Write a protein that binds this ligand. Structure first.
Ligand code: NI
Ligand code: NI
Lengths: 134, 134
């Protein structure tokens, strides 16, 4: 109970969050989080969204999250294959197009945008905190 | 409740860091940090500066730190009354003006600027981490 999260991460709720250092395309951002035994940000509730919007209010830049879609006939899914809960947010940006490497979502000034996954952006990683979960 | 830092703060070393939610004058920024049992950022060492430069790499905004003086007849001091270590950074900007409410310093894009304290910036709060349970 004394060390929920490592240094340089942010503890919130049952998880730890990391501003990853690099600016990379979505696939490389995914690999970076996985290399840390973590995953790209998964917004699971309105409380999570509120937390992230507050946590990024010091920055105007985009941050990749773990949401992607091969083309518009597929659902938006998190990396674990679960869907975007429809009450959380409405993806803006490049929602009609199809790109060779897929479309991915980032958050920027609290709003969520679709973009060609080849864009280099910052990303947020998360992992479970070292505590006894409910 | 004996972990290093509260939820939402970044734990680094001996300290916990919090980015402000918005842009305010130095006095209001100082009071926010005090309300959190914290102070505005103090940069003690090159290692602290390296950490801060990385932490603000995600932003183009200015961030007040706890460095101020009333006019050029005074030394630059942190809120705790201790002096600035001069090797850390050049203080750019308005160093030699006398302003009615003093001159204060912010960091922006890794560079430190003196500015009239009544103008607004984001800010970084700092407080000592609780490490005895580690
Ligand atoms: Ni513990
Ligand atoms: Ni505790």
């Amino acid at each position: 109970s004394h060390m929920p999260c490592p240094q340089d991460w942010i503890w919130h709720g049952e998880n730890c969050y990391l501003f990853s250092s690099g600016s990379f395309n979505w696939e490389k951002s995914q690999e970076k989080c996985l290399s840390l035994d973590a995953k790209l940000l998964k917004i699971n509730s309105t409380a999570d969204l509120d937390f992230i919007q507050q946590a990024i209010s010091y920055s105007s830049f985009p941050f990749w999250m773990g949401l992607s879609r091969r083309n518009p006939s597929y659902p938006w899914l998190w990396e674990d294959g679960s869907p975007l809960m429809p009450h959380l947010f409405r993806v803006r940006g490049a929602v009609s197009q199809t790109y060779p490497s897929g479309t991915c979502a980032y958050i920027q000034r609290g709003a969520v945008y679709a973009e060609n996954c080849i864009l280099a952006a910052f990303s947020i990683c998360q992992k479970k905190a070292n505590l006894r979960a409910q």
